[PDB]
């Protein structure tokens, strides 16, 4: 999920955006 | 070297920015 994708690893804008409501 | 990881309060601030008026759900690990 978001912590593994963006904290442990590095994520891109549309990966982040997909977590939005 | 500069750190690209987004963790903790920095991660929820990123969501606040990108999600804008759409909002979001989030669960702190803390």
Numbering used by the authors:
A (entry chain A): 1 to 21
B (entry chain B): 1 to 30
Manuscript text:
In the cases of [PheB26]-insulin and [GlyB26]-insulin, we aimed to investigate the structural consequences of the loss of the TyrB26 side-chain hydroxyl group or the whole TyrB26 side chain, respectively. Only the previously reported PheB26 mutant had less than 50% potency. The loss of the phenolic side chain in [PheB26]-insulin also results in a ∼20% decrease (2–3 kcal mol−1) in the B26 side chain–insulin interaction energy. Although the dimer interface is maintained in this structure, the release of the PheB26 side chain from the water-mediated (Wat1) hydrogen bond to (NH)CO of GlyB8 (typical of wild-type TyrB26) leads to relaxation of this surface. The Cα–Cα distances between wild-type (TyrB26) insulin and [PheB26]-insulin increase from ∼1 Å at the B25 site to 6.3 Å at LysB29.
